Amino acid sequence: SSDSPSAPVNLTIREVKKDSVTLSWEPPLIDGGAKITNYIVEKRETTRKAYATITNNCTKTTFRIENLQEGCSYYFRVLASNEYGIGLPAETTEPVKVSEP
Numbered sequence: 001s002s003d004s005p006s007a008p009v010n011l012t013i014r015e016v017k018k019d020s021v022t023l024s025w026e027p028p029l030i031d032g033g034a035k036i037t038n039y040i041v042e043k044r045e046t047t048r049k050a051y052a053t054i055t056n057n058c059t060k061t062t063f064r065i066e067n068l069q070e071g072c073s074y075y076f077r078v079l080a081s082n083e084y085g086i087g088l089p090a091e092t093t094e095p096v097k098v099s100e101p
Helices: none
Strands: 009-016 023-028 036-045 052-058 062-065 074-084 085-091
Touching: 009 074, 023 036, 023 074, 052 062, 052 074
Parallel strands: none
Antiparallel strands: 009 023, 023 062, 036 052, 036 074, 074 085
């Protein structure tokens, strides 16, 4: 059916620093019609409407988002992609505040 992938599994915030966040995830349970080729990582400030893509070419299952706004709260999304399209996102349930510990 040439389906796209399902959502990445168990998206985890691995690290939260002053203005960066490291995410990790497990591959989707459904690759669809073809193998996973790349992951798309996105951010959204709690005060913005639209998600901003950080990278569309993440090939590992972990990624560090940098140059965030210290003191700002964010949602993050990771989407899985195969040759046939982009799947549904895995998203952080709570917003993450980046700040110096």
